[PDB]
Design a protein around this nucleic acid. Structure first.
Lengths: 106, 203, 129, 158
RNA sequence: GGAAAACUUAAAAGAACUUUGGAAAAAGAGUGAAAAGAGCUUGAAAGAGUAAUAUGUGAACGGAUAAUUUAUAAGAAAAAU
RNA sequence: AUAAACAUACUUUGAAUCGGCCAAGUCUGGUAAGCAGGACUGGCGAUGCGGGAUGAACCGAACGUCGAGAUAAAGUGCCAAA
RNA sequence: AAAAUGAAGACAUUUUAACGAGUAAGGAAACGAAAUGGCGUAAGGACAACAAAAGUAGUAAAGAUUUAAAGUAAUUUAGAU
C-alpha cells in the first residue's frame, strides 16, 4: 500500500571487546550518515517484525513484533541505541528493523 | 457485634462449632471489588482538566498525514480538538479519502503546510456524545452468550447517524476540488520513495 | 492490594562440578579449594550465593497468591488464622487423610480461609464420575 | 520378569517370552532389532536366511572388530554378521507366540512384530587359568527376550 | 588364619487343567486384599533395553540474554447524576 | 598548620606463620644469567575485573544484588564497541 | 554506630549515615534493643483439638521416583505414582 518506515539493520548489542550488554541494541538507520542527523530519530518508534511458521491447529499469530524506542546516538557515523520491550534475539543480527515516523514532533 | 474481620457465610448443614452463628441469623453479602470511583461528567463546553497542548503547527483547516493506525498513510482535515478527550477530530472527507469522522491522538499525525481553511463548517454536534454514540461496544459479561451477531447488528443500527453527521463534509469537499491536483493528492496514499529521508523531508 | 514480589535471581545455585560428576550432588557447597575456579571468581564462573541476593523483607516468604503459608493438621488449627484470613493461607499437611481433609476444607470455607491443597487427595471423581 | 509394554488391545495381541536364555545378549540385541516391525509371516523367512547366511544382521551398536560384508549395503551400517544361535531362539518364541494367536482366534496373516525387547540377565561365572598363578572370570551373557504380536490394521482420526 | 549369608502371605490357599514345545518354559485359566510367584516386604544409584521427543563438520558439559514449542497459571464484578 | 569520639589507652586468652617470589631513574660477587645475596617502597602469595592477542607480579582500579549515566588505562580499516 | 520506642506487634522493632574483595586463622550456647545468624541426622525429657476423648495415620505411615512453590544458601513445603 505505502511505505511509512525506514529500514534499520540490527548490527548488534552494545558491547566491548570481550563483553556484551543485550539491554541496548545498536541500529543503523538507512540514510543517516552522521550523528548530526540523529536528533530527528531520537524518540521514534522501532519495530522488529518477524514471521513464525505456525500450524493451523494453533491460534498464535504468524507475524509477531517487538517494539522499542531510539534513545541516543552512538558514535559519529549515525548509529543509534534502541531499547525494546524484550531483548532482541541474536538470531536476528543483520536483519531489517522498521523505524517508524511516530511519536511525531512536527 | 461481629468483629471487623468476621464475615459470616452460610453452612450447607455441615458441622459448625458452637460459637459460630447458625444459618437462620446469617444474611449473605455480595462480594465488593470496585473501590475507585469513575470519572465525573461535566458540561459539554468546559474543557477538561486533562487537556493536551497541541503543537503550534496544528491549526484548524490544516491537512494532516496519519502515519499510524488503521488509516496509516492517509490524509485528513483537522477541524477541532475534542475538549473532553484531547484527541483531534479530523475528517479525510469521505467522498475523497474514505476516512470517516474519527478521533486520533496528535502524536500519530504530521501537520503539513497545506491549509484548506474552511470556516462555517457547522460542527454544532460531532462532540464527545457523538463519538460515544457511534462507538461499538462489546457484549458485557452476563448477557447470556450473544456471540458474533451482536456486533454485526450494531453497525446497521448506528449507520444512519454516521451519515447524518456527514453534513460536515459537504463544505470541505467543494473547497478541496478548487486547488488543482489537490483532490488527486488528497485521495492518494503518502509514501516514502527513494531518497526520501525523514530528517530531510519538510512539510 | 498486593505488592510486586521481586526476585533478584530466579535460577538455582548449583554445586560446582555437579554437572560433570554424579557423586557430586546439586546442593550448594562453597568451594574451599586452594585453586578452585569458582571461589576465585573467574570470569564465566563467578556465581556464588551472597546476602545481596536476598529478596525484599516486605515481600519475603510470600506465595504468588499474595499470602503466606500456615500448615494445618486439624480443624482447630484453622482457628489460629481466622483473624488473619487476608494474610495467611491454610496448607494441609502431607499425612492428613482424605476424610479429615474434607472437614478442614469445609470449615475453611466457613471461616473464609484459603486452602492451597483444595484439590488434594481427592477421590476418583475424574473418570466415571 | 515383567513385560516392558502392554498391548493397546489385549484381544488383538499375543505374547511370548523367555527368561535366562543361554544366548549372547550382544548378538541377540541385534537380531531382535532387525525384525522389529516386520510381519511375522516375513520375520520367519528373514530369520531362516540368517541361518543359511543369505541375509545380514547389521551390528549397528556392537561393531568393534566386526568385519564388513557385501550384504550390508543400504542399511547405513558397514558391518554385519549371521548369528545362528540367537536367530533360532527367536524362531522358537515366534512359533510360541503365533500358536497362542491361533488359540485366541487371531488371524495369522495380519500379525506384525510390534514389540520385541532384550534385557540383560544374571551371568554365570567360570575359571580361566592364566600365567603366574592368576585366575580370571569366564562369564556367560544370558538375556531375557519378550515378544508381542498385534493385528495390524489402519487407524482413523476423522 | 578365618569369613559371607536376616524378611513371601494373616493363612501355602506354593499356581495344576488345556494348547505350543524334546524339555526347561510360554500363553491362557485359577488362588489370594494385593503376585507379594518362591532369585518372593519396599526396591535407590552405577550399567542396559523399549517407547516418546529433540540435536549434530576434530571433545562434551555449565552461565548471561532473547526467539520457538510445551507446561504451569490471573476474573465476575459493574459509571456519572 | 592539618586531621582525629564507633577517637584514644589498653588488659586477658589464643590461632596461624617465620621455604617466599616480583618490579625498580638501586647496590655487592660474577663474563653474564629467568644466577646468588642485600637498603627503601609497592605488589603477587591471599586477587578477581577493564587493557597489553595469550602472561602471579606490568597499566587502570581492588569486588553485596541491580537500573541509568558520565569516566580510567587505552583504543576508533575488518575480526572489534568507537 | 547513634538517636526513638518498647510486654510481645514482628520480619530479630522505627529512622539516619557510613560501610560489604580475601588464603592460613578467629568469631562455643544464652544475653529486648540481644557479645555473628542459621539448616540438617539420630536418641532422651516435656509441649501439640483446652468444654471430659486433645498431633498425623488402612478415607493409607515411613521409604522411593518425579512436578511445582518458599529460602541468598544450607534445606524446607505440597501434588501425582
Amino acid at each position: 500500500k505505502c511505505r511509512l518506515h525506514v529500514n534499520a539493520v540490527f548490527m548488534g548489542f552494545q558491547r566491548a571487546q570481550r563483553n556484551q550488554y543485550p539491554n541496548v541494541a545498536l541500529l543503523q538507520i538507512s540514510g543517516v550518515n552522521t550523528k548530526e542527523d540523529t536528533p530527528f530519530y531520537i524518540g521514534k518508534r522501532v519495530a522488529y517484525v518477524y514471521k513464525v511458521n505456525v500450524k493451523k491447529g494453533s491460534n498464535k499469530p504468524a507475524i509477531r513484533a517487538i517494539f522499542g524506542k531510539i534513545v541516543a546516538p552512538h558514535g559519529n557515523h549515525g548509529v543509534v541505541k534502541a531499547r525494546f520491550l524484550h531483548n532482541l534475539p541474536p538470531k536476528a543480527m543483520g536483519q531489517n528493523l522498521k523505524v517508524f515516523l511516530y511519536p511525531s514532533n512536527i | 457485634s461481629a468483629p471487623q474481620w468476621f464475615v459470616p457465610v452460610k453452612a450447607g448443614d455441615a458441622k459448625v462449632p458452637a460459637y459460630y452463628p447458625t444459618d437462620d441469623m446469617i444474611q449473605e453479602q455480595k462480594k465488593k471489588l470496585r473501590t475507585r470511583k469513575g470519572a465525573k461528567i461535566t458540561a459539554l463546553d468546559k474543557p477538561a482538566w486533562n487537556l493536551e497542548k497541541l503543537r503550534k503547527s496544528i491549526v484548524p483547516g490544516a491537512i494532516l498525514i496519519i502515519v499510524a493506525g488503521k488509516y496509516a498513510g492517509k490524509k485528513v482535515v483537522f477541524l477541532k480538538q475534542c475538549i473532553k478527550s484531547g484527541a483531534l477530530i479530523v475528517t479525510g472527507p469521505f467522498k475523497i479519502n474514505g476516512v470517516p469522522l474519527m478521533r486520533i491522538n496528535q502524536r500519530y499525525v504530521i501537520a503539513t503546510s497545506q491549509k484548506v481553511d474552511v470556516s462555517k463548517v457547522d460542527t454544532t454536534g460531532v462532540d464527545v456524545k457523538f463519538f460515544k454514540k457511534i462507538a461499538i461496544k462489546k457484549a458485557a459479561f452476563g448477557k447470556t452468550v450473544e456471540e458474533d451477531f451482536a456486533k454485526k447488528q450494531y453497525e446497521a443500527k448506528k449507520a444512519l447517524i454516521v451519515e447524518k453527521q456527514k453534513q460536515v463534509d459537504e463544505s470541505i469537499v467543494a473547497e478541496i476540488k478548487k486547488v488543482p491536483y489537490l483532490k488527486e493528492y488528497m485521495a492518494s496514499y503518502f509514501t516514502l520513495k527513494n531518497g526520501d529521508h525523514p530528517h530531510l523531508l519538510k512539510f | 492490594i498486593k505488592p510486586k514480589i521481586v526476585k533478584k535471581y530466579t535460577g538455582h545455585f548449583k554445586r560446582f562440578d555437579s554437572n560433570r560428576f554424579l557423586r557430586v550432588k546439586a546442593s550448594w557447597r562453597v568451594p574451599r579449594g586452594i585453586d578452585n575456579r569458582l571461589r576465585r571468581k573467574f570470569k564465566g564462573t563467578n556465581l556464588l550465593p551472597k546476602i545481596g541476593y536476598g529478596s525484599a523483607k516486605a515481600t519475603r516468604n510470600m506465595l504468588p497468591c499474595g499470602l503466606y503459608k500456615f500448615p494445618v493438621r486439624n480443624t482447630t488449627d484453622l482457628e489460629m488464622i481466622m483473624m488473619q484470613n487476608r494474610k495467611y493461607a491454610a496448607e494441609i499437611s502431607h499425612a492428613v487423610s482424605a476424610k479429615k481433609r474434607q472437614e478442614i476444607i469445609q470449615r475453611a470455607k466457613i471461616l473464609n480461609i484459603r486452602v492451597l491443597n483444595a484439590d488434594a487427595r481427592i477421590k476418583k471423581q475424574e473418570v466415571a464420575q | 520378569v515383567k513385560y516392558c509394554a502392554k498391548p493397546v488391545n489385549v484381544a488383538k495381541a499375543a505374547q511370548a517370552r523367555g527368561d535366562n536364555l543361554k544366548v549372547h545378549f550382544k548378538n541377540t540385541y541385534e537380531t531382535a532389532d532387525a525384525i522389529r516391525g516386520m510381519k511375522v509371516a516375513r520375520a520367519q523367512e528373514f530369520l531362516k536366511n540368517v541361518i543359511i547366511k543369505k541375509e545380514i544382521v547389521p551390528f549397528r551398536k556392537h561393531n568393534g572388530g566386526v568385519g564388513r560384508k557385501a550384504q550390508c549395503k543400504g542399511l547405513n551400517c558397514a558391518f554385519g554378521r549371521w548369528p545362528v544361535k540367537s536367530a533360532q531362539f527367536i524362531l522358537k518364541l515366534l512359533k510360541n507366540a503365533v500358536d497362542n494367536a491361533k488359540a485366541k482366534g487371531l488371524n495369522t496373516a495380519l500379525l506384525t512384530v510390534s514389540h520385541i525387547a532384550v534385557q540383560e540377565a544374571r551371568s554365570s561365572r567360570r575359571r580361566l587359568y592364566r600365567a603366574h598363578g592368576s585366575i580370571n572370570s569366564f562369564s556367560s551373557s544370558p538375556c531375557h527376550i519378550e515378544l508381542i504380536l498385534t493385528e495390524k490394521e489402519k487407524k482413523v482420526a476423522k
